Amino acid sequence: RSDGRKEDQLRPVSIQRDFLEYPEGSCLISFGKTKVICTASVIENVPNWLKGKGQGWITAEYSMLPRATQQRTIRESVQGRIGGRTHEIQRMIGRAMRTAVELTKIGERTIWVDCDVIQADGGTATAAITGAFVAVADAIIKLHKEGIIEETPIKDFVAAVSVGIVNDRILLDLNFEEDSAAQVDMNVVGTGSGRLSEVHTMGEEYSFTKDELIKMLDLAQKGINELIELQKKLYVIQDGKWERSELKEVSSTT
Amino acid sequence: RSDGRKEDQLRPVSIQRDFLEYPEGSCLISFGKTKVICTASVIENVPNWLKGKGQGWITAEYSMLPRATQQRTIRESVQGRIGGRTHEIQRMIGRAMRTAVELTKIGERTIWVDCDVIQADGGTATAAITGAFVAVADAIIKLHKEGIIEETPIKDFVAAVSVGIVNDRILLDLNFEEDSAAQVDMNVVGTGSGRLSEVHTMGEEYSFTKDELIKMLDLAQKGINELIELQKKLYVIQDGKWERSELKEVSSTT
Amino acid sequence: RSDGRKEDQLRPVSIQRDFLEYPEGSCLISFGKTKVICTASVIENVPNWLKGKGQGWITAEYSMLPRATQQRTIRESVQGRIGGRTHEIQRMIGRAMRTAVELTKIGERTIWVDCDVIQADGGTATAAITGAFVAVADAIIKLHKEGIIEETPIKDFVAAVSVGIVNDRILLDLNFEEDSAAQVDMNVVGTGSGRLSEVHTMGEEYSFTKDELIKMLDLAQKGINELIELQKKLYVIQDGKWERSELKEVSSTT
């Protein structure tokens, strides 16, 4: 592969917590040149349709700063029309975070997750999900430490990674060139206990077999596991009680 | 199940070609109460980025008439903001159609696919993909018969179906109630030769296992096969040459 | 005339009730190649400005599926700006339905009328009004049969037709070619008892005389009457009590 990386090998991964001061939780995550700021802010309110249902909510906003993929990704501000792509990913990030949290125990508040891609080189959505978790966990731990909530109702770790078939090779965690040249690309969102939260496989004018899907899913689950091993070094958990470890940054040895 | 249907059983399916006169291809497809009008219109032009590249294009527009799911699905007209959901599905339908067609041989024109859901009861997106194919195939056959193009460059049939886990039961082709009550729902897009074009599995605040994904994918591929057997009765193909059969409508015996 | 039709002759008309299952009322109407799906759905609420005024409301949404007039009528979704034309017609349809109904007796609910043009060849707005009535009447009858309301407060039938001056000939019910070539075109909305609800005459860079307006209005009222004779076969009315006849479809003998 271009970067001299193996086929079943992730790019250098780095996760830095406490990136910013104001959010209850925040981090700067990077998969290679792909960099995303993930923040988690508590809003002392809930969406109208949940009012009074004794439950919290998590929702997410994703944005790709104009300078992405070394090209131009002009925001949704000084422009107009909005892409259902940004929306597709925001919904993805939202589903991943809610699956990992027992919202029953968050109280009637909302964790507003913001994922700001400050540099894109493929895998930006899976990088955002991986980072968003750390920011959400930190934010729940912060809320607990402040006494706003009784426990730290986090069910499990959540991470995500991309995989694809390029020139008939199954590659793990694709950068932008590999993805634009892929016959089949795929995003996988997994949990700490080895389960799955989401899987989206797409043939790019090429079809694939059930077996190729499984091969890809197998490689992705291994990628997810390595990412979760990194995330794990950031926490100290016991019987459902979460505390942050003393690490402020964790990175892959690659 | 509510409708007395089995777990590995599709709802009554009906596909009617030549539903409208003006489009090069058109049909009314129905999966139960879910009904979608699928039309395919040729536009003698191409997207700027393809100009001169000796190739055709296929793109799709999906809309859900206000009266859907027995509720209100107010269009994107007399309103304002647009959902990335409509966009997510339009992109899905577009990918499915392009995968099934050798665009090299369509010439520099575009097949504009319109999917109009006139009644929603779950599975509307997979129903639209299933119907869109018939309209695209008919339209290519029509273009051939008119002498606009040399052959009928259709690679294979394409159909799609939903599957999910509801109250820990794996169900095929979900209606709206089963889907809103599902722990995991999934859309699968497959081909004539038994391959896959797309798979999207989503945990709805529940995670799942690789094996459950495979069980679901297995049930879906069987569903896809039954839908493609129906579609097949509408065509007579030999060595890549496509002609319409004499059927104007095909329906499942259920 | 192109289609071999006489000057004071309507195109073949067809009205099919119960086209869809979910709406309280629904039909597929066609004036030649012009086809419109008209549905009427009850929303158990009212516009804020009517709250508590012991009255119901009727409002309408009109849309022209991209494939219309054998050309491209891209919706208001994956685009942006909205035309005051769609709005002009929605307001027209709304005025026609409210005139035909004693809203005092509908209770505080709204009949949401949806007119979806699935094929356009001129006269689409008058076709929608003609069809919308049948869907609204059926919906009121349905509400009565369900016991939601005491009576069937329908004042009279409502239908509409276009007329114009083309190459100095006064033609009834124009298709798309006649209308684009017309010096003066006009839409007329009339009632069962031979009265008028709306009339809009427009010189297309040509002016006309009071007498020509009357000639046109006379031809239109005859057209309206024929359309209302068709609609009438769909109902059995006595002393203001409306019941559906046993016909599911009615068509002109032409």
Place this chain on the structure above:
Amino acid sequence: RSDGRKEDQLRPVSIQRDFLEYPEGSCLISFGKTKVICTASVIENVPNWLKGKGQGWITAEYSMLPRATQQRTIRESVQGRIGGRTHEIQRMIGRAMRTAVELTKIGERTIWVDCDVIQADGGTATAAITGAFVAVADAIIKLHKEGIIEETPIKDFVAAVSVGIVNDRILLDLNFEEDSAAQVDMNVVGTGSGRLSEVHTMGEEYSFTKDELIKMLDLAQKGINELIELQKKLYVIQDGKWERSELKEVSSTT
């Protein structure tokens, strides 16, 4: 009537030409408290679809300054959604101006008509059409005087007025209260030679008869004639050559 005005009587009318300096043509017209600034500006270009067709174009923009009808008519700027009503009227004004001008002889340029309602008390659209004509005529005369065009290709005067049925009385030129209380209201656009350009009659939850329409149309044509007699004092015409008279303002004696 409220203002002590007769049923077949217009409000005090005033037309002032040369209201502004920059536009080729401009005026401030008033029907009672209804006041509209009408300007006509030449743009040395044409809409793409007319390029090279040896013809000019006229199009119009209508706006209702927030302070209208003594209430709030917040513009389309610091808001968002646009009403098809503004559009309906802009199209009306456009049709009226083009009918009155032989566009063949204007050259490939466009007369951009701007109608700015600075005070609304009913009849604002008909007032705008009445005023827009004067601004368009002046602008064509100005273009001629500057040598940009050979002649003054104006076919005839154009004016417009409203009429309605209120408490079963047929009233001419309605103010805002009469119009909101009307059973049937109507806008009529007529020419110098007594012909018609447009007529739009609308039952407001009340239907009407062919004869009532004629009575109303008769009253309107008389109103149109009085307005055109005023406009006429502003010009000196002979064999199709138009020159401005020496009047800068003309008003009705009422």
Place this chain on the structure above:
Amino acid sequence: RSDGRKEDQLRPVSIQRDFLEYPEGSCLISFGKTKVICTASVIENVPNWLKGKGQGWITAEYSMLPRATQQRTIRESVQGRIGGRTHEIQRMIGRAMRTAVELTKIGERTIWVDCDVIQADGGTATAAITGAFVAVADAIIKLHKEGIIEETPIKDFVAAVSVGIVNDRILLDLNFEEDSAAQVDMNVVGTGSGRLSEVHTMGEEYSFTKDELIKMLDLAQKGINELIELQKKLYVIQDGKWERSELKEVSSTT
């Protein structure tokens, strides 16, 4: 200078109160060819965030009718995207009016200020502020005379003017040509007692010195004073009680 005007000389200024009848306050102001209609309307309500805070509010809407600067300034209606420029000026006008009024004493109502530029030749924003004051003062006086409020809580006069450096000359009140050719342009908003409310100086690809800023500010304050001397002739004030003088129009002797 082009118009034969001196460097420290304003263009001919004219202010006409009672321009329209419906607004509580209104005027037509002109700085040369720059003309702006300024109206002030009372809305018996307040912005949600002020509800119950025993205070009034003033906000402003600015619009530039398509015919401005002898060019085309197409509104925000039949277009789409909005400029932050219109917003920048609306905020400016809002700040100027609120500074001049003791909102504590207006009650819980809002003065809606509308500034409609009907002709642009530079200095349109400062002209609007100058005119908006007169309309706001008149409106407060009107509210007092109607007994809606106890006193006339107007703190002081407010006026504004532009100044710039053109070909290294410091000019007062620039028309459109001088401003587009300026190296540095500036808007100043001042009060009756010689104080300042706002100052915005902008280098147009040229930088300037603190001293040049002061020279410009000095010239502007003299301009502001002359404009306020004009405004003053429109009122008769004593111990904070404001009454209108008998002048309906005031103009500079130039």
Place this chain on the structure above:
Amino acid sequence: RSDGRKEDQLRPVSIQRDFLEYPEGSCLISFGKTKVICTASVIENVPNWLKGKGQGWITAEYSMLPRATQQRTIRESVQGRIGGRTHEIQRMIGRAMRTAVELTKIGERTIWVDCDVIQADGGTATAAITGAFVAVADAIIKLHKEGIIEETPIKDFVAAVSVGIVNDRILLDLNFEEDSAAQVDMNVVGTGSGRLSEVHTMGEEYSFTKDELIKMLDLAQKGINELIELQKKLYVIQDGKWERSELKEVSSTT
């Protein structure tokens, strides 16, 4: 002051160049808790109105990530309406950068400046201008080193700072609390040689004197000078030739 800072004292300032890899120039700047990512990307094209005029262009995009001022600043994406405030600042940043660059010598390309506020505590716009310069200078130096352009046509350093009057005290560089409580706030944009590019002073319902403006401007120019002394350590310049120093980060000793 709250933070124990003096009245004529800036918050701790930090500027880090090469923050990201893809942009030709980039940095993370911080004034206290106020943090902004500033990137400069070259687009090998120019705005249509400049085509062929042998000149380059600089334009800017500013955005405030939802998590700002410890509150919610929801972007312009999944929302709709846009604020003229974002636009006001983008125009400010654009004017500052163009003033500092001899665009004649950049060739026909555009430097696209992106300012992404990742944490807001007042002074975010002046912080963005201060940071944007460093990114633009680096980008021009980068373009030179790559041989795309002959020289490094940078005229001078540009920096900006806020100042205000709070409880009658003139404070330098205000955080969010001081600014919301200020009677008069002001933004100043200055150059390396001690000149000014922009000054915007705004009374917040309070007026001020020419002398207070000068006092504030004096304090700001001292602030600008300190910021420019920091920026200066990042470059080594001689006779108009710019090279980066070896520092990657520079911070104030405070």
